[PDB]
Amino acid sequence: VEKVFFVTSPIYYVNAAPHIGHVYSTLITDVIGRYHRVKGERVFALTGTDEHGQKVAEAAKQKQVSPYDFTTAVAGEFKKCFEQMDYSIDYFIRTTNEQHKAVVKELWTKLEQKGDIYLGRYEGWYSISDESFLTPQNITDGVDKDGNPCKVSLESGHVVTWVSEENYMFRLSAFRERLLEWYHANPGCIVPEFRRREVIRAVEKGLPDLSVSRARATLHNWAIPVPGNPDHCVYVWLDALTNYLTGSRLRVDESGKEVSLVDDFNELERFPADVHVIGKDILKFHAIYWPAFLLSAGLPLPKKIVAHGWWTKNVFDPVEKAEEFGYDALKYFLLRESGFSDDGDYSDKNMIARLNGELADTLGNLVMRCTSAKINVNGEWPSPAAYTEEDESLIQLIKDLPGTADHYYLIPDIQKAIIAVFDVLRAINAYVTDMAPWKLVKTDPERLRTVLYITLEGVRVTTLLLSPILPRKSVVIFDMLGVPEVHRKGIENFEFGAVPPGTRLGPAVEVLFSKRS
Ligand code: MET
Structure with missing residues (x-):
């Protein structure tokens, strides 16, 4: 199948300013895109920002500005940073984009028509900072920003809270066998290999169903409404993961503005992604949830997910170092110094x-x-x-x-x-x-x-x-x-x-x- 080579970065949360993590992930995406262009292939490289959810609305509240103004300002900062870093990314997507919202609604509706979304309850732990549901085995004791005693995530050390809400639930448990078939039939689909083994072990243990909505008050109304139920909002991760599908369906003009959303992804020959570049912190979302959603919808699965050693979400300013040592030199260094680990001298x-x-x-x-x-x-x-x-x-x-x-x-x-x-x-x-x-x-x-x-x-x-x-x-x-x-x-x-x-x-x-x- 001759197609457009489709490479993506994660879309970054706009709670804070661009830092080295985001620059690194997008650099990897850019290099892969550039190599395939040098090889003579058609390429579409995607990056952008994840703008909805509790965590962004709470960061906006802290700064005493509206979420709309806050997200627009921070997205602007990411855009400026990526222009300065001299990437050759084909499009910058924002989840506040009205064409993205339409795609989220279509995908939601498709999953619902298949019988894969039901009304249920989530009672359990949640990390707002990771936008992540956690079982009791992934939490332990720690301290909050102040120092009072609380629960934290084993994954990230961030504060967790107990949520008890009636939620739309995606039937993730029904996709265990098909996900395991997919991993085994495509043994290069997750890189590096030890991260692939981690995913397989996790899915072998068993998969619970996944909450894909939240009550609108919890998200400070800063989210995409559920189709046919305005009391609920779409889980920021279903929203976020869907950017890859949206991006694959946008016709983009010579200046980088989206001008049109096509109905059928096959028309632009990008979907599914050849490479999803991610940090190791979001592996489960990309290697378990995402393909399960795609399987439910009857959409094709990505070819490769590459998970690097850094985190995605003592100062090190990449633009400062690039002005000091050179842009190409800094890029060379970041790519040469580390493989798929953290142990590496910066x-x-x-x-x-x-x-x-x-x-x-x-x-x-x-x-x-x-x-x-x-x-x-x-x-x-x-x-x-x-x-x-x-x-x-x-x-x-x-x-x-x-x-x-x-x-x-x-x-x-x-x-x-x-x-x-x-x-x-x-x-x-x-x-x-x-x-x-x-x-x-x-x-x-x-x-x-x-x-x-x-x-x-x-x-x-x-x-x-x-x-x-x-x-x-x-x-x-x-x-x-x-x-x-x-x-x-x-x-x-x-x-x-x-x-x-x-x-x-x-x-x-x-x-x-x-x-x-
Ligand atoms: C669909 S990729 C979403 C990534 C997430 N917003 C993060 O910063 O980790």
């Missing part, structure tokens, strides 16, 4: 070590070497003479790299993709050191042509595969190398030899990444 010390060691010394040094007037005297891509075995060993690494990096990007595992590209960059550097092309200008011009050609081509291929990570710097490198625009994307240009000998380098001025103390 200090100025480590940022500088990676900036200096990998970006400046490995990549940047190598870009300057192969384009300098001292070594590349004609300022062009030379024609290679015959290859030695050592030449062939490096060429083989360069040729294998696109296949290797591609598999990593598709897992997705961006850290391993970066590591694989840099392994090849290190090998190119070792080769340049062995061949001493600076000596070869005088001693053996015929040999230098071969060495310089291989070096230029290794730099091109590595840079192409790093272009989703370093989108601006990749453009600078390609300009220095004189790579025509047509050769800067497309799977055809993953092949060794795509830029012919005779191609002129770009003009010189001059640093790519400047080292720090």
